[PDB]
Amino acid sequence: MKYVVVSGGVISGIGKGVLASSTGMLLKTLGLKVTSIKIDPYMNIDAGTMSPLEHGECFVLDDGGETDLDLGNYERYLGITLSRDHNITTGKIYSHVISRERRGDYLGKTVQIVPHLTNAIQDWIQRVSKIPVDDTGLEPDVCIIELGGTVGDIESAPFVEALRQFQFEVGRENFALIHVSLVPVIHGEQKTKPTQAAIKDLRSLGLIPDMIACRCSEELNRSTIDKIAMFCHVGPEQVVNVHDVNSTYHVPLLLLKQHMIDYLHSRLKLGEVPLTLEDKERGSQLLTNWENMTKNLDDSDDVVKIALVGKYTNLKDSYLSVTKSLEHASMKCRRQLEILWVEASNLEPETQEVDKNKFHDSWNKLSSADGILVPGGFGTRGIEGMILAAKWARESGVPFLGVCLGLQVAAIEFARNVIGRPNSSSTEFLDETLLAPEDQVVITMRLGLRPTIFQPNSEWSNIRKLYGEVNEVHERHRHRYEINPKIVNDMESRGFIFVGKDETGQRCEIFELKGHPYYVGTQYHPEYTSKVLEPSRPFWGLVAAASGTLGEVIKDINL
Amino acid sequence: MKYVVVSGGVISGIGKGVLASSTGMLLKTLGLKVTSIKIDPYMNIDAGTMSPLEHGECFVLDDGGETDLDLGNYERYLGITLSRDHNITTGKIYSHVISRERRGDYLGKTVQIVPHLTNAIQDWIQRVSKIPVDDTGLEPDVCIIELGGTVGDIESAPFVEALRQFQFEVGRENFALIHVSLVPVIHGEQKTKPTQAAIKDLRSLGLIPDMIACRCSEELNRSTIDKIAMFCHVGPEQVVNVHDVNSTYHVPLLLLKQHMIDYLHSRLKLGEVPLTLEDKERGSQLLTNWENMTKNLDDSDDVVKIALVGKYTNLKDSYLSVTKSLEHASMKCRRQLEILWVEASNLEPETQEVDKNKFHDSWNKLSSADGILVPGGFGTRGIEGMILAAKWARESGVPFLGVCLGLQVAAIEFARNVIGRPNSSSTEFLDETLLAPEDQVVITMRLGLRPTIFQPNSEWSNIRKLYGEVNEVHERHRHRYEINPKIVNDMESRGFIFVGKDETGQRCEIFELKGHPYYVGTQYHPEYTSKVLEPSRPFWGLVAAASGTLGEVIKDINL
Amino acid sequence: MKYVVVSGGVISGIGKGVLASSTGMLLKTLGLKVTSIKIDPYMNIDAGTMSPLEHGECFVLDDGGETDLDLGNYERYLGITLSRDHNITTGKIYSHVISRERRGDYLGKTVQIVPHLTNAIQDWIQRVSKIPVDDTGLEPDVCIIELGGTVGDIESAPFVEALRQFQFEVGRENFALIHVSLVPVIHGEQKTKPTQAAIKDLRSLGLIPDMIACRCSEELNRSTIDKIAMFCHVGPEQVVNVHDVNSTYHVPLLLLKQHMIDYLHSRLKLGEVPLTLEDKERGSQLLTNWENMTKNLDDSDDVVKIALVGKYTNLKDSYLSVTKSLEHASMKCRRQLEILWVEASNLEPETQEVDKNKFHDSWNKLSSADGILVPGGFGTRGIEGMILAAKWARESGVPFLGVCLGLQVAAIEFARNVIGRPNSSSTEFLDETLLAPEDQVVITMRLGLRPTIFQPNSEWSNIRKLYGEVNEVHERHRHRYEINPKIVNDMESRGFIFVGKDETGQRCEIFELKGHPYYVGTQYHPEYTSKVLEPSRPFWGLVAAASGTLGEVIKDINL
Ligand SMILES: Nc1ccn([C@@H]2O[C@H](COP(=O)(O)OP(=O)(O)OP(=O)(O)O)[C@@H](O)[C@H]2O)c(=O)n1
Ligand SMILES: Nc1ccn([C@@H]2O[C@H](COP(=O)(O)OP(=O)(O)OP(=O)(O)O)[C@@H](O)[C@H]2O)c(=O)n1
Ligand SMILES: Nc1ccn([C@@H]2O[C@H](COP(=O)(O)OP(=O)(O)OP(=O)(O)O)[C@@H](O)[C@H]2O)c(=O)n1
Ligand SMILES: Nc1ccn([C@@H]2O[C@H](COP(=O)(O)OP(=O)(O)OP(=O)(O)O)[C@@H](O)[C@H]2O)c(=O)n1
Ligand SMILES: Nc1ccn([C@@H]2O[C@H](COP(=O)(O)OP(=O)(O)OP(=O)(O)O)[C@@H](O)[C@H]2O)c(=O)n1
Ligand SMILES: Nc1ccn([C@@H]2O[C@H](COP(=O)(O)OP(=O)(O)OP(=O)(O)O)[C@@H](O)[C@H]2O)c(=O)n1
Numbered sequence A, B, C: 001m002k003y004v005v006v007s008g009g010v011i012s013g014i015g016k017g018v019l020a021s022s023t024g025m026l027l028k029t030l031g032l033k034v035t036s037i038k039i040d041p042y043m044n045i046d047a048g049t050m051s052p053l054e055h056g057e058c059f060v061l062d063d064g065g066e067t068d069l070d071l072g073n074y075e076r077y078l079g080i081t082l083s084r085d086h087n088i089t090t091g092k093i094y095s096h097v098i099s100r101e102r103r104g105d106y107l108g109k110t111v112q113i114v115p116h117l118t119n120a121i122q123d124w125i126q127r128v129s130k131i132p133v134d135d136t137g138l139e140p141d142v143c144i145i146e147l148g149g150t151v152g153d154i155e156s157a158p159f160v161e162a163l164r165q166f167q168f169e170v171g172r173e174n175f176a177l178i179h180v181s182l183v184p185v186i187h188g189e190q191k192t193k194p195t196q197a198a199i200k201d202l203r204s205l206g207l208i209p210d211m212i213a214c215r216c217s218e219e220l221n222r223s224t225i226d227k228i229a230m231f232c233h234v235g236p237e238q239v240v241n242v243h244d245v246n247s248t249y250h251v252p253l254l255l256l257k258q259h260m261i262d263y264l265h266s267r268l269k270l271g272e273v274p275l276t277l278e279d280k281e282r283g284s285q286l287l288t289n290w291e292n293m294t295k296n297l298d299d300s301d302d303v304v305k306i307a308l309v310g311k312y313t314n315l316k317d318s319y320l321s322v323t324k325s326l327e328h329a330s331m332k333c334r335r336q337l338e339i340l341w342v343e344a345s346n347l348e349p350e351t352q353e354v355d356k357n358k359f360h361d362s363w364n365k366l367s368s369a370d371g372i373l374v375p376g377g378f379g380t381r382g383i384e385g386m387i388l389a390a391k392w393a394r395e396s397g398v399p400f401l402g403v404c405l406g407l408q409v410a411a412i413e414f415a416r417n418v419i420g421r422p423n424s425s426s427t428e429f430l431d432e433t434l435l436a437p438e439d440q441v442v443i444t445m446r447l448g449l450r451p452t453i454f455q456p457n458s459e460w461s462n463i464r465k466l467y468g469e470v471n472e473v474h475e476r477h478r479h480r481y482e483i484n485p486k487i488v489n490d491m492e493s494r495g496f497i498f499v500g501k502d503e504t505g506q507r508c509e510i511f512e513l514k515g516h517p518y519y520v521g522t523q524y525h526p527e528y529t530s531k532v533l534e535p536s537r538p539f540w541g542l543v544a545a546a547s548g549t550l551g552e553v554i555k556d557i558n559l
């Protein structure tokens, strides 16, 4: 086993999550079975309690574990599947050892937070890094630990102590620390004193740093690096600069130009880890897929405009997984992406009574879009705008994907505007009216990776061509409310055909509309399973249809 | 009793199985009641657990014993019937003696693998070689043992020790060893050092060789033989060469030109075995049937093209028994065979959306074929191509045989395309839909040689003419799923007549379609029962219909 | 993790088990949490099927796992508790992977013994060496693997391959090989060619040796070591000599004079393993307990004679754990031990009709003994001699311990000779007579470590003083037959008081007779739990009573 801990910061907004998700990617190019752990200093047990307004979207794992965003960034960069244990939190570990006290397992000793709770952290990291994460049950070679918060805090405090002991309870040369740090620029001069005042605290809290990964606004001066290597004890080759480049998928290749694999190969003796040619050649091939997709980003010019239609579009992190899946689908089509933020409530005609500028800008963005996405919203208060965009996408022939709530407004749209029931309703919203035309029903939660089976006649469905025509699809779910299955025999007659269903047959999970270029609902969330080299099939479908050449993508899949 | 053990190899891919199946054939020309034993060093109990992708097809014996391919090669060369005991394996003998330990039969001694387990091998070979195998219950005169793996391994190790003791526990002059060996050619020179480095190991592991059966790319030089006879202790007449010739049915006659009967008659004193004229004259007559059928192969020119339509056609060993039965049927018709590999999924119209070249090449091969075979596939994922080939074979009048799954897609085709139920389905595939037009039902396994009785009106059926009009047929089965017997009264009315059924009447086992030149389903497997001088009657039917002169074959049978 | 494999031999009787049990002891003096694994090439699943005549006694583990003797030698040298998984066997691993085939877990591949079964060995050793074995659930630092059989065999063959891969699947510098070897002496010359013909085979089978641990009859000549270091590649300091010394408890200190800790500290980098002072100071203290107890053996002169009374005394290995527990008890009392082998059937008066010399020698040895032991025999055919020795031990006041069957003949003796029922009987023997005075009953097996609770009044019992007066005792059991609990209220009245019972109260497990210097039955086996620095309390009681100063031992315990 080996560990690399990514850590530090003068400030908590500094962006450690790319250097974690990008260090682990570079180590996966050596062919190593890499894994990752997030530490979050917040008290939440797991993210399911905190709304998407409050620091971004509610992620989903194979377990159903509603979790921190930063798990998702490692899953999509590293190709790995994570579990709800990979998110260490102050909530979890304190709830764990305090529940263990009432169980009695410390034999009625004191449960001081030094010794015993820092021992539970060091045990948890050693459990979790041995859980398998790739397509086979082989245990990881290297674990990337992202230490949330900063080193020099009061929510960080048990973790930085636990990791001082863990620098020895796992031997040095099986552990390395990467310290992210701030180097401000003021009046044209690079200021390395915030960094030198977090190297003092790092040595004090007891870890010793290996890298000094500065988030400067610039290239670091040769004299700036020379002084950081005088005040921190690292050699000047190790003072990596992580400055902005044309997209975040380039960041691994900047770190590779900055020798970071050659340093980590030495500093963790990675030549002593046992690897097969099936490991190593997969490693060097994955490097060439990353060099190819970044070269394709560097000279892709032909734009594709996708309208993302929903509430809270000013909080873009409320959709981080939706955005990132369109970026993967974009780079695979070799069309450059623009996403058009349509704040759905502005499409509703009553907006014309409040501000006409909002009513025109939103319908302008929607009309300009080469493809349309209803992105699995939350709450109900924007729903009429999401219905109008689904009417537009059906009648104007524009490519369409409905995710989760998106499948459900598509059924509501089709009921109101093709089946001809204008009172038909989201039972998710208009409940205590008790009306008969209910497009949905509550069936109290359903979460995690679940099996979707294709219905028998489905051969013609573009969505089934995009899934490689395989009879079952494994994808991640969230929904309380599902389509009322007593309308399905009507929709099945009117050309709205339910391509895919749950294994009991009673629950509807995919539809495709007959006789449209690409119009799909998926009631699972296709966002979360997308990887940077394997875009999620419904999202690859959307960005292909909007680019043209949907047929040529269907060959690239099925060959 | 006498034994000939066929053994050895520098490399395991060297092809011992022909020299075994061809040594035993030469001894059967002396009229001896020959038998054979396969040793397989793998840990499988029996082949039923390992899929046809993984080292070829899943064979079937009279017992229902799902077994190694190499049993089949002896059955068809030697005319013998084998039993699941004739396949010795590392799985079987270790499962046997370790189960015998918990039963207690070693009286609470240690069960060392020397002495006791090598004694169980020497007991098993002495049990098995006394089991009868011909058309009468007479015990074998000579047993051919094929030692799988190589002599000089760790999976071979108990067998080569057991056979060192067995060289004495059965006397010398009742035992002989044939060592197959590699003589590479490099820069134009024959290299006999791989062979001399397996004669060293053979003497070391303790058996002494009799023959040195080289698999060179060439005729062995007279100086190459002279040096192999200097480093091995065999005389130069005994260094047989087993080089390639125009078909594997010639290999016995090469070994007969190379004195191998005259040597084995001496080296095992085969003149001292008691034989009747009914043995000896059957022996010398069978030799003339082999000289005749090889002479017929040497100047047969008129081709017959048979389309073999199924999944995994790149894995030709997944169909080894199907191929070999067509070769017997070919040589009996005196038409030279070409088999057209139709990878069935390419016939499905959706292939035109993926690669048109595959769609044309597959329909081109199918259209070019003089006869068509649906070869008892496995899984379900190619089934629509196998249905289209059955539609083609019915409407275009081309000769057709459906084996196992082949009978079942023929019923599905006939239901969809003549009875007019386009939703009718393989219950083997489309199960949890619970539809009413089920062409099949599960009835949990059914294996081995079973009795098929012809239904009363059957006199006109070409398949019943090919079985000599005899009222019952004994053939080998495998099927979980069988035709739904509640459709049969419809098919019986529409000219799809079930010529043969199980003894209870409730299960359907053969059909022939009225008013077509030759269109047959058999739900048993006709492949496995074919012998090199007695081709399986449905396969003799197919290759005759495709050659023309199906009527002239029906005289050759019934006279 | 670290491994040391102890291996090799020109001959299998060479005595590797001391060098294993003594290498692991030396590593435990560094304070490392050492564990050990036995490999036995025999086909037995576990030793319960093989009688104590056939290669020695039937051991017992905490699990109830009836196991190879050699587990016991590590338990008593290393202080560790083992589990039935620590005994790898050819029986177990082949029964495991062949049972795994019928379960299907190789996905229907071939299960060749190369790749897949050698992978199961390498998995089993990596599972087993992480099971905890000390008084706390901390996983081992170093594992000693004793490779049974020899390197250069056919029962060894999968293990030596598995260990060639395991030299890399665990990195070099986490693995070391110790090769035990034979150096015969003939006509006064040391012959190192058997050794040089097992170094050739070792390199061939692919492991590389580190030590060359010769079992010569002598000190190795400086020229003999120099030539072994010329033909093996080890340096001459590493050619350890393991010659005979005054008792086997000295062997670790010979290996310590021969630098073997200083070599293993270097060759496995044991300075890089994390240790506490509670580890290290326990390590260096345990070394001084071993230096003290070996110094006490070097000048202890005052003999104590213990009669071991039972069947099969010519097969001393049928009692190896009984003998070894008396040696621990001896060295703790500082009296030198003689054990008097009383073949129990010779004490029976009918022997006087067959050979008077046997009748006198056996009663002479019994009369000469300072203490008496009935050692948990097997079968029944010597029982009357074991009853007469129990009569003698009760009436002549001599110190007595009955183990298992020993407690039971003590109840039978007391019934016949104090309660006055001369027909009272072992129901273990005289069953189908159906008599009313049954001293025993069948209650179908009971095995492993079980809880014994002391009965309330027990304060005066010397056995309860020897157990430190603690209310519950944890010790290892074997018995089908137990004392008939309907006699206990009589024995409890006559001064035969059942000091200890099972937690249900219904089963009787210890007795002590009132008003005798030391007379104890234990129905568990106290032998197996004795350690070289912690002799089993009933056996420490016996050898103390026989030495005199039983009171002074009771202070050494309770202080
Ligand atoms: N490979 C990555 C990593 C991060 N981000 C972006 O980074 C964001 C949040 O910043 P991040 O780098 O994850 O760190 P912070 O949120 O600043 O938090 P912290 O520094 O506490 O780790 C999101 O907007 C996400 O789009 C990204 O696009 N690609
Ligand atoms: N740890 C330090 C670093 C610097 N100085 C002194 O503080 C003066 C002003 O600090 P500065 O020159 O700004 O040093 P930097 O570390 O570069 O500060 P910044 O990065 O913000 O420019 C220096 O000339 C030096 O004499 C100090 O006392 N202690
Ligand atoms: N009389 C024979 C014997 C073998 N084969 C061909 O030989 C094959 C496999 O090789 P074989 O000679 O059976 O031996 P190997 O598979 O090489 O295995 P081994 O050498 O371990 O016995 C099959 O493709 C089969 O068509 C054949 O056509 N006719
Ligand atoms: N068992 C043997 C055989 C040959 N030689 C020597 O090795 C030399 C080279 O071997 P080579 O001449 O190639 O002998 P072959 O056995 O024919 O090797 P190959 O079949 O590969 O040509 C010979 O001249 C001979 O002196 C040897 O030492 N031991
Ligand atoms: N620390 C030890 C180790 C072994 N023995 C003695 O050694 C015996 C058996 O020999 P052992 O050294 O265990 O090995 P072998 O039986 O010769 O078997 P192998 O060489 O196959 O391991 C028993 O009589 C036992 O008394 C001992 O007294 N003390
Ligand atoms: N591997 C070896 C070792 C020795 N010799 C030769 O064989 C002769 C006789 O062997 P010996 O002198 O007995 O060597 P040892 O290895 O000591 O044999 P032993 O230990 O039995 O005395 C030696 O003089 C030497 O020339 C050899 O050919 N090959």
Ligand SMILES: [Mg+2]
Pocket: A012
């Ligand atoms: Mg803040």
Ligand SMILES: [Mg+2]
Pocket: A015, A016, A017, A070
């Ligand atoms: Mg972050």
Ligand SMILES: [Mg+2]
Pocket: B012
């Ligand atoms: Mg191979």
Ligand SMILES: [Mg+2]
Pocket: B015, B016, B017, B070
């Ligand atoms: Mg073969």
Ligand SMILES: [Mg+2]
Pocket: C012
């Ligand atoms: Mg022996």
Ligand SMILES: [Mg+2]
Pocket: C015, C016, C017, C070
């Ligand atoms: Mg031993």
